[PDB]
Amino acid sequence: AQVDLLNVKGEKVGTLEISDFVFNIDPNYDVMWRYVDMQLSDWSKKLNKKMKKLALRSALSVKYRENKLLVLDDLKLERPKTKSLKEILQNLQLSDKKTLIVLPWKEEGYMNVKLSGRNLPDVKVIIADNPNNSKNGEKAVRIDGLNVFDMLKYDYLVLTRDMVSKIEEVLG
């Protein structure tokens, strides 16, 4: 599948190739709603993991197929400032839209975007990187925080290129 890669000025900077397995499957609505319920209220464990990933892929596919997915080359702010994020959202023609922004790493530039979204109702920013401590030696690639409920609650989904890569590494 393909999606335009945009910058914070709202200009197209490339054409990103993304996995059809992750972003363009026929959404399994039953599995998707089942996981929304779970977040709100051996072979089995493996099957359950697969169902959970299918729920996420179904939701991402809904966003892609409904033309509600935007991917930016990157989205960082040198300093937190609500107006800065508001201006970027205006450039992306999302000023009046409910938007979920999902960032890849717990680093200053992304934390600043999350802080800048605090005072914008209708915008939720998730940093899908929750390692707590620096886990001994190895750190798995995880997209903890990305959830079906928010993807369906918010009209548009904004990801960065590296966030797409993380999603593909986990769900692909």
CA distance to 44, 60, 87, 108, 135, per residue, from 157 (Å)? 31, 9, 17, 21, 29
Domain ranges across the chain: 1-172
Tell me the C-alpha distance between 84 and 66, whole Å.
Answer: 27
SS3 93: coil
**Tokens matching residue 122:** 């209708």
- H-helix or E-strand spanning residue 152: helix 148-153
- Strands of the sheet containing 69-72, edge to edge, are 12-17, 2-6, 69-72, 156-160, 99-103, 123-127
Q: Is the Cα dihedral 106, 75, 5, 145 positive or negative?
A: positive
> What is the architecture, at CATH level 2, of domain 1-172?
3-Layer(aba) Sandwich (3.40)
Handedness of CA 134, 140, 141, 142 (dihedral sign): negative
CA distance 21 to 5: 19
Report the distance separating Cα 52 and Cα 170, nearest Å.
12
Query: Which of 121, 107, 97, 122 minimizes the C-alpha distance to 77?
Result: 107
First to last CA, the chain: 13
Helix (H, G, I), strand (E, B) or coil at 149: helix
For residues 9 and 91, the answer to whether their CB atoms sit within 8 Å is yes
Supply the DSSP string of 16-71, one letter for each residue. EE--HHHHSS---HHHHHHHHHHHH--HHHHHHHHHHHHHHHHHHHHHHHTT-EEE
Q: What secondary structure does DSSP assign to 113-140, as a single string?
A: HHHHHTT-TTEEEEE----SS--SS---
